[PDB]
Design an enzyme around this catalytic site. Structure first.
Site, PDB file in Angstrom:
ATOM      1  N   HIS A   1      38.597  57.377  41.529  1.00 58.40           N
ATOM      2  CA  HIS A   1      38.242  58.024  42.255  1.00 58.40           C
ATOM      3  C   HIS A   1      38.849  59.197  43.081  1.00 58.40           C
ATOM      4  O   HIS A   1      39.910  60.239  43.390  1.00 58.40           O
ATOM      5  CB  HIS A   1      36.742  58.078  43.006  1.00 58.40           C
ATOM      6  CG  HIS A   1      36.305  59.802  43.632  1.00 58.40           C
ATOM      7  ND1 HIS A   1      36.222  60.393  43.050  1.00 58.40           N
ATOM      8  CD2 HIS A   1      37.258  60.031  44.545  1.00 58.40           C
ATOM      9  CE1 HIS A   1      36.588  61.708  44.250  1.00 58.40           C
ATOM     10  NE2 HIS A   1      36.408  61.552  44.937  1.00 58.40           N
TER      11      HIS A   1
ATOM     12  N   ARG B   1      32.948  64.503  25.089  1.00 58.96           N
ATOM     13  CA  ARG B   1      34.344  64.334  25.272  1.00 58.96           C
ATOM     14  C   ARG B   1      35.062  62.945  24.339  1.00 58.96           C
ATOM     15  O   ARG B   1      34.272  62.401  23.603  1.00 58.96           O
ATOM     16  CB  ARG B   1      34.677  64.212  26.075  1.00 58.96           C
ATOM     17  CG  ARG B   1      34.601  62.703  27.631  1.00 58.96           C
ATOM     18  CD  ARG B   1      35.611  62.579  28.332  1.00 58.96           C
ATOM     19  NE  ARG B   1      35.301  62.034  29.474  1.00 58.96           N
ATOM     20  CZ  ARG B   1      36.323  61.985  30.102  1.00 58.96           C
ATOM     21  NH1 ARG B   1      37.632  62.496  30.216  1.00 58.96           N
ATOM     22  NH2 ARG B   1      35.713  60.548  31.165  1.00 58.96           N
ATOM     23  N   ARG B   2      36.470  63.422  24.636  1.00 58.71           N
ATOM     24  CA  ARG B   2      37.338  62.518  24.000  1.00 58.71           C
ATOM     25  C   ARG B   2      37.208  61.933  22.119  1.00 58.71           C
ATOM     26  O   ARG B   2      37.113  60.831  21.937  1.00 58.71           O
ATOM     27  CB  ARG B   2      37.364  61.047  24.548  1.00 58.71           C
ATOM     28  CG  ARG B   2      38.115  60.968  25.626  1.00 58.71           C
ATOM     29  CD  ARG B   2      37.793  59.364  26.716  1.00 58.71           C
ATOM     30  NE  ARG B   2      38.397  59.589  27.762  1.00 58.71           N
ATOM     31  CZ  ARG B   2      38.398  58.619  29.113  1.00 58.71           C
ATOM     32  NH1 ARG B   2      37.546  57.522  28.007  1.00 58.71           N
ATOM     33  NH2 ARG B   2      39.282  58.141  29.257  1.00 58.71           N
TER      34      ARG B   2
ATOM     35  N   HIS C   1      35.060  70.619  34.317  1.00 62.57           N
ATOM     36  CA  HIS C   1      34.992  70.196  36.086  1.00 62.57           C
ATOM     37  C   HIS C   1      36.709  69.619  35.773  1.00 62.57           C
ATOM     38  O   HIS C   1      36.979  70.886  36.634  1.00 62.57           O
ATOM     39  CB  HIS C   1      34.126  69.234  35.924  1.00 62.57           C
ATOM     40  CG  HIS C   1      34.147  68.213  37.398  1.00 62.57           C
ATOM     41  ND1 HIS C   1      34.097  69.116  38.365  1.00 62.57           N
ATOM     42  CD2 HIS C   1      35.069  66.936  38.154  1.00 62.57           C
ATOM     43  CE1 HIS C   1      34.578  67.453  39.210  1.00 62.57           C
ATOM     44  NE2 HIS C   1      34.677  66.529  39.069  1.00 62.57           N
ATOM     45  N   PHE C   2      37.045  69.087  35.911  1.00 61.54           N
ATOM     46  CA  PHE C   2      38.372  68.890  35.950  1.00 61.54           C
ATOM     47  C   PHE C   2      39.275  69.317  35.657  1.00 61.54           C
ATOM     48  O   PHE C   2      40.531  69.878  36.576  1.00 61.54           O
ATOM     49  CB  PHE C   2      38.199  67.632  35.950  1.00 61.54           C
ATOM     50  CG  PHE C   2      39.040  66.848  34.869  1.00 61.54           C
ATOM     51  CD1 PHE C   2      39.890  66.965  33.733  1.00 61.54           C
ATOM     52  CD2 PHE C   2      37.890  65.796  33.983  1.00 61.54           C
ATOM     53  CE1 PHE C   2      40.167  66.876  32.620  1.00 61.54           C
ATOM     54  CE2 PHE C   2      37.759  65.062  32.635  1.00 61.54           C
ATOM     55  CZ  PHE C   2      39.175  65.453  32.080  1.00 61.54           C
ATOM     56  N   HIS C   3      39.290  70.783  34.745  1.00 58.91           N
ATOM     57  CA  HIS C   3      40.549  71.431  34.596  1.00 58.91           C
ATOM     58  C   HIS C   3      40.599  72.473  35.349  1.00 58.91           C
ATOM     59  O   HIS C   3      41.089  73.053  35.904  1.00 58.91           O
ATOM     60  CB  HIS C   3      40.132  72.397  33.292  1.00 58.91           C
ATOM     61  CG  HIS C   3      40.969  70.655  32.020  1.00 58.91           C
ATOM     62  ND1 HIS C   3      40.710  69.948  31.732  1.00 58.91           N
ATOM     63  CD2 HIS C   3      42.680  70.470  32.018  1.00 58.91           C
ATOM     64  CE1 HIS C   3      41.640  69.528  30.801  1.00 58.91           C
ATOM     65  NE2 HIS C   3      42.290  70.250  30.587  1.00 58.91           N
TER      66      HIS C   3
ATOM     67  N   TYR D   1      41.593  62.778  44.808  1.00 51.12           N
ATOM     68  CA  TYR D   1      42.387  63.271  45.900  1.00 51.12           C
ATOM     69  C   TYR D   1      43.118  63.617  46.789  1.00 51.12           C
ATOM     70  O   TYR D   1      44.560  63.949  46.718  1.00 51.12           O
ATOM     71  CB  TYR D   1      41.632  62.197  46.930  1.00 51.12           C
ATOM     72  CG  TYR D   1      39.885  62.533  47.026  1.00 51.12           C
ATOM     73  CD1 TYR D   1      39.296  63.584  47.241  1.00 51.12           C
ATOM     74  CD2 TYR D   1      39.330  61.447  45.653  1.00 51.12           C
ATOM     75  CE1 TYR D   1      37.912  63.914  46.839  1.00 51.12           C
ATOM     76  CE2 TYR D   1      37.906  61.875  45.778  1.00 51.12           C
ATOM     77  CZ  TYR D   1      37.170  63.548  46.360  1.00 51.12           C
ATOM     78  OH  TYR D   1      36.113  64.036  45.980  1.00 51.12           O
TER      79      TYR D   1
END
Ligand code: HAS
Ligand code: HEM
Ligand code: CUA
Ligand code: CU1
Lengths: 166, 552, 33
Positions: free
Chosen positions: B223, B439-440, B374-376, B227
């Site tokens: 995680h 995913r994947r 989310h992460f894109h 950041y």
């Protein structure tokens, strides 16, 4: 100006934080709520349960596919599932609805996903550990299991089936 | 330009290496977007790139190059260079070039196995999936490069404290310091995983690795690492953007507090990546859930602090009413634009994350296409765009090469496209995720598997084409900027566009507290032992190592 | 000058989105219960 904008900016900042903490604590409450309900079953069991992934389909509760389901209460059935490189034993899994099914899932090789389409059963399955989850099916019919953790070239094709008898 | 600011060169070498990685990784993007639009474009890519073996070799390369190589090299650039120029101090150059060589030697060594289809294990590399040793050794050396970078900055910071006895750390340096300390604590998960398990395994010293402890240690680092990707972008947004916008950073103390809180809460939250894992106590997951909710706070402050600064900026530029300040911003400047749009996408991104972090709610979307959605919006949008726009001030500052009007408008196309595409993709991936699409997964090779995702599969196709074009334009422009023999030396010796800081009376006492970094670093270190200690103690007691597999 | 109406605007959008997402999925969780 500038300095007058500073205080006001810092003031509404403190208000924003107060509100944001409050909204997060409301979220914290509504989660705690689900932790007290039936729907909380889907959280994998905390206690470690160690198995051998090399001896899993040759001795013990995963060896025989015919022995996979087991009545273990008056309305409780434990199902011993095994997710392996590119499939799920038993296939399909057969269980009665309105019964509490207690899955105990492992793998003999690598990490798989166990995601029962249309439910909250979404758990990682670890070679050498037992993923224990509890669920009740309320609607009967054919539920499709998907591997949602990359397990090799044949991962996109790893599907299973849960059969909940009306 | 290089002999008295030789840090200027080293910083360029990081950025170049970092933008190459980004390009090579991104190539697979379009194909993956199409794949999630149920269109199989891979026989075409496999014709173009004959070394590529599988969808999954592609995915490894896309993750590693982008989210690991690009992002680290960009942080190592910004979070050394930005403090260096603020302090007007030279980093230990011996050490700086050592960290670059490590990152380059490490990158090459790992590359060889990746490209040789010898460790198609994705950027998470979860055992028992067993990669080629040179993957693990390469990664190690690549990530240890940051341990030199930590040192470098601490050194700068100590040395400045000496010449300014009892003065408060300047803003950027403060950011850089808490940054690199936080990363240090955070890296300890992965380093242990590597040192105790993945290295001896790959070398053949041992024949098994426990997957549960391996993925626990992974996520301890896992995680905070995001950041680590975000904060270099935050540093730019807080201290340079407001100047690009025509205004000021409205609060020094806020920015400090945001960053401090990251130092505190970045690391002790890893279980939000293991909500669906067995052998971890449900109480520890509820705890890590709450601390995760708290780690949202810093970004919640960021959002106000930053939105104020741009309102203020908008106001000085002759802002109007409720929305006037928005139109008065410099929308012609890609250096302003790129990171603002990134911030727009970050709103849906954050809401996504908070959902994921709500324990029981993770089961709805865990491992589905929602997660990549989310992460894109976070890394591929906010971080990448801020990185891209920042070339417009950073590249000239480093090379002395100006930027023509054409290249400025080229950029503007690139930036808008990339943003639109990502947004289009985000609608796609989230929608597919709710629809249980995993995913994947090479899902275009099983076309009849997910008919219920008909319409969001369109978006995914659309994104892929838009983002293809944007990518090619990026490469065309970026190289047009680096390959031109235009040089003004005087803009290479032009100070960075740092922003002014508004400051009041109350600041002093609060800032002072926050400048007790040694105390906060020990507080942070304790939180890590309290959150992970009890559980790690319990897994290490009961190690159950299983043998490796290669399934590609 | 005064109240950051614009910033307040932005954090409102942020808050509302969070609620759409959070409440939206909280429903789906019970729906699959
Ligand atoms: C760089 C990218 C990273 C960021 C940043 C990030 C943010 C969060 N995430 Fe995440 N994430 C999770 C929780 C969060 C939370 C709570 C946040 C928070 O930090 C979000 C905080 C953000 C906000 C609270 C919003 C602030 C908004 C701002 C600051 C913009 C305002 C805009 C303005 C002011 C512009 C206005 C301008 C005008 C001109 C009007 C969880 C669960 O708790 C999962 C697990 C899912 C699963 O099951 O696998 C997860 C999954 C991932 C994965 C998958 C890992 C893998 O491959 O397995 C990656 C790579 C990733 C990266 C990142 N993630 N995340
Ligand atoms: C050209 C624009 C991009 C496109 C079209 C794109 C597309 C995609 C898609 C569709 C996936 C899902 C693949 C799957 O789940 O099988 C993916 C995965 C991923 N992307 Fe990208 N992406 C782009 C840029 C980026 C950037 C710039 C980064 C980071 C700096 C990034 C980081 C990742 C990561 C870490 C994964 C996950 C790989 C994994 O699950 O191991 N992407 N990309
Ligand atoms: Cu089993 Cu993917
Ligand atoms: Cu996380």
């Amino acid at each position: 100006d500038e300095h007058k904008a500073h205080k006001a900016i810092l003031a509404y900042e403190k208000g924003w934080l107060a509100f944001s903490l409050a909204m997060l604590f409301v979220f914290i409450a509504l989660i705690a709520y689900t932790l007290a309900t039936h729907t909380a079953g889907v959280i994998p069991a905390g206690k470690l349960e160690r198995v051998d992934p090399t001896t899993v389909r040759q001795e013990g509760p995963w060896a025989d596919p015919a022995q996979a389901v087991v009545q273990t209460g008056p309305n409780q059935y434990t199902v011993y599932v095994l997710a392996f490189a590119f499939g799920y034993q038993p296939n399909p899994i057969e269980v009665p609805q309105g019964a509490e099914i207690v899955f105990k899932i492992t793998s003999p090789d690598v990490i798989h996903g166990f995601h029962v389409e249309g439910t909250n059963i979404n758990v990682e399955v670890l070679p050498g550990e037992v993923s224990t989850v509890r669920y009740t099916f309320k609607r009967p019919g054919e539920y499709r299991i998907i591997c949602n953790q990359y397990c090799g070239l044949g991962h996109q094709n790893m599907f299973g089936t849960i059969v909940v008898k009306e | 330009v290089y002999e008295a600011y030789p840090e200027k060169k080293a910083t360029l070498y990081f950025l170049v290496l970092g933008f190459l990685a980004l390009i090579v990784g991104s190539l697979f993007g379009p194909f993956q977007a199409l794949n999630y639009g149920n269109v199989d474009a891979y026989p075409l890519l496999k014709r173009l790139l004959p070394f590529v073996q599988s969808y999954y070799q592609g995915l490894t390369l896309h993750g590693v190059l982008n989210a690991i190589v690009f992002t680290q090299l960009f942080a190592q650039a910004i979070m050394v260079y930005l403090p260096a120029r603020e302090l007007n101090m030279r980093p230990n150059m011996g050490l700086m070039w050592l960290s670059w060589w490590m990152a380059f030697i490490g990158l090459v060594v790992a590359a060889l196995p990746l490209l040789a289809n010898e460790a198609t294990v994705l950027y998470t590399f979860y055992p028992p999936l067993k990669g080629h040793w040179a993957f693990y050794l390469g990664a190690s050396v690549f990530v240890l490069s940051t341990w030199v970078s930590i040192y470098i900055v601490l050194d700068l910071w100590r040395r400045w404290k000496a010449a300014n006895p009892g003065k408060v750390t300047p803003l950027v340096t403060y950011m850089a310091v808490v940054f690199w300390l936080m990363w240090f604590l955070a890296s300890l998960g992965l380093v242990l995983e590597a040192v105790l398990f993945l290295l001896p395994w790959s070398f053949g010293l041992v024949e098994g690795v426990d997957p549960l402890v391996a993925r626990t240690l992974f996520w301890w680092t896992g995680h905070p690492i995001v950041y680590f990707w975000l904060l270099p972008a935050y540093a730019i947004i807080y201290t340079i953007l407001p100047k690009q916008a025509g205004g000021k950073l409205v609060s020094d103390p806020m920015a400090r507090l945001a960053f401090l809180l990251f130092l505190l809460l970045s690391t002790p939250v890893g279980f939000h990546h293991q909500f669906a894992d067995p052998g971890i106590d449900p109480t520890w997951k509820m705890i890590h859930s709450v601390l995760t909710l708290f780690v949202a706070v810093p970004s919640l402050m960021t959002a106000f602090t930053v939105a104020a600064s741009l309102e203020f900026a908008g106001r000085l530029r002759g802002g109007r009413g409720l929305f006037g300040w928005i139109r008065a911003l410099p929308w012609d400047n890609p250096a302003f634009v790129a990171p603002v749009l990134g911030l727009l996408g970050f709103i849906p991104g954050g809401a996504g994350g908070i959902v994921n972090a709500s324990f029981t709610l993770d089961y709805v979307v865990h491992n589905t296409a929602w997660v990549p959605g989310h992460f894109h919006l976070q890394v591929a949008s906010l971080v990448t765009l801020t990185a891209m726009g920042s070339l417009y001030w950073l590249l000239p500052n480093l090379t002395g090469k100006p930027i023509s009007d054409a290249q400025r408008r080229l950029g503007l196309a690139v930036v808008w496209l990339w943003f639109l595409g990502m947004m289009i993709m985000a609608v796609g991936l989230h929608w597919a995720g709710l629809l249980n699409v995993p995913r994947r997964a090479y899902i275009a090779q099983v076309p009849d598997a997910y008919p219920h995702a008909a319409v969001p599969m369109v978006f995914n196709v659309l994104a892929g084409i838009v983002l293809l074009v944007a990518l090619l334009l990026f490469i065309y422009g970026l190289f047009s900027v680096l390959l031109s023999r235009e040089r003004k030396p005087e803009l290479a010796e032009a100070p960075l566009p740092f922003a002014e800081v508004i400051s009041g009376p109350e600041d002093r006492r609060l800032v002072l507290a926050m400048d007790r970094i040694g105390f906060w670093f020990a507080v942070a270190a304790i939180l890590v032992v309290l959150a992970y200690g009890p559980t790690l103690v319990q897994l290490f007691g009961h190690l159950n190592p299983v043998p490796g597999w290669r399934l590609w | 000058e005064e109240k950051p109406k614009g910033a307040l605007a932005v954090i409102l959008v942020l808050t509302l989105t969070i609620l759409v997402f959070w409440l939206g999925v909280y429903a789906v969780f019970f729906a699959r219960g």
